[PDB]
Amino acid sequence: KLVRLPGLIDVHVHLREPGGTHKEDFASGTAAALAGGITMVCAMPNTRPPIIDAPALALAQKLAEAGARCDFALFLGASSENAGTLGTVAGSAAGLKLYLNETFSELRLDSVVQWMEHFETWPSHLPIVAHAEQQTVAAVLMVAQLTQRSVHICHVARKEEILLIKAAKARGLPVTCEVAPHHLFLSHDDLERLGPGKGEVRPELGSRQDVEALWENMAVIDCFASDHAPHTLEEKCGSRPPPGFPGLETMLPLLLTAVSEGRLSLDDLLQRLHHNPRRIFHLPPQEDTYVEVDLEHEWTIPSHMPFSKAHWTPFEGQKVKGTVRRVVLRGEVAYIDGQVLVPPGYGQDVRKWPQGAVPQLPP
């Protein structure tokens, strides 16, 4: 017996196009998404060129429309020059992304005052998400309060961070957050196996106590999102390993295994991969869209999953229970048992759908 799930949403993926297409592109990354039971993705802006102005967004929209196999929305990225310049295109994006820790020069913000300027100028009804680690979580929460609006914290990875967010929620502050599978299923204990290159990710892998704390505070976690961050094995194993793990094809099987073990319920999972992403990012429903999974099938994660161009996975060797058998997207069979059956270009920009615009008060 298969279980029918709604179309799942991953609000944090790096699809590398334009400019890093040896690592992934829209066509390969969305194939990976479909194989992982994901029917809608939100793509991050740290491409080359980065999506930090209207022309770069226009290019990205066309590349995505031509290459995506599932539906999508594209983030804009905050820079040190673009506050106050994104108003005309803001509503067409998934949201605004702030890189508040390590990143490349084009997306670096040198001062908290620049964070404030973005919070003040970005339209108040549209999402803002932040890469914010450790004390940076508290700092960006302060900026959000000074500017009287909400913020969403990406990939919470530490006991310190989830407890801070928990305290903020207890005070009624408008903050939401997401957690990535590697911060729930890997830890320092895995670094010996992974090695120093493969093991590089930001936020870094946590201690057993960090992992435990995330599970214990599941009530505080609004969304799961992969932070799919593909790089090739050559890059990961080289002299300057870039941070990041591929994760679209492994996320749902890992979480289904946890459901099967009673670590969280099926509903807990669907709140975090469907309902909460929809409501935080104002993402529209997908008509005639669903995922069929087999919860009984036991398998071992191989050295690489079929679709991502990363061609490696840090979860190699983990035993899982649960598999995606079929995906239907807008009334077409998109995936069955290892075969993707919708072409590049089948996917659409959900922000262009009437039901995908974020509601706002008139001027």
Next chain:
Amino acid sequence: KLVRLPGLIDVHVHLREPGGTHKEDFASGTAAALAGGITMVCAMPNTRPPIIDAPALALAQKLAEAGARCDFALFLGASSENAGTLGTVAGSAAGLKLYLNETFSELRLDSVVQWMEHFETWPSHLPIVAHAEQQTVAAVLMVAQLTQRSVHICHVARKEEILLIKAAKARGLPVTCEVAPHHLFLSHDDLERLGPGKGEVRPELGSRQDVEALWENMAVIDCFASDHAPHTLEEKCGSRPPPGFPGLETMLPLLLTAVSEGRLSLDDLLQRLHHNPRRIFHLPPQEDTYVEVDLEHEWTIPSHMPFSKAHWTPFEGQKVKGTVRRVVLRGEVAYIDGQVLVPPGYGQDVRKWPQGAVPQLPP
């Protein structure tokens, strides 16, 4: 004609006793204070051993009572073990000091949750001050709001920081701050002259734009405080230079020069070296205490000032106008024209005076 000033207060000094007495001790540091027109100092807890428990505070109190030539209060320091343990001695301290950036292991806090624990456990009516740079200012402000209390930010050194504090004040948040003379009178432009060892300080010297921003936002600055942080020249010029400048003997002459140039008023100076320190730290008046200064005398800062054991100064070569001529402390001549005339042990712990206890609601 001399101008009579009230007894000035420096709320941020490192007097190095116990454990670093080759750099300074209570007797030498308070001699330096008196020579700088300061009659009351608040001493930081990063001594060896650090002042992080009741026994260390008891030792420090006796060393200060025996060695101090001016009056004083002693900070307690926050550690990763002492939250919830300082209640019985808290009221006897100047306040609680949090080192939120670089420091030695005993005072290191590894998580924002530890900051929260201190804000929750330290008595709500007593001062908390923080070494908090750049985004750490925003982070500690968030913790203060979550716990519904005030915080004082030490040595604000950057445009970024003073503008964040300005924004917080505009929102009615209970935050105050201090600025050190080196962040008003030195900048990157001075690093060539100082060299990489002498130039080491935390917070680091700022750009011309940082310095300009502090002056332009003088209204945001509640206090001046030296961050007197003495180290010997051997240490500063060695292979592992410790951060810090001596500053007690140079602070007032630098600021008097600025007053003479119309950069701030005499009142602006006295708010920041007398009234605001009193009211933020609940420090008592000193009876029969005053400082006489000569505002006309032009001199050049030498390679070392007479009293601090640091025996060097980063202000060497600067031209100043204004000199301390006489200090009277509690009815005794304490300093005249280069001679200290009160012995070690003349100074008293102001928190033991009836008028020096911080008022609180009964239990």
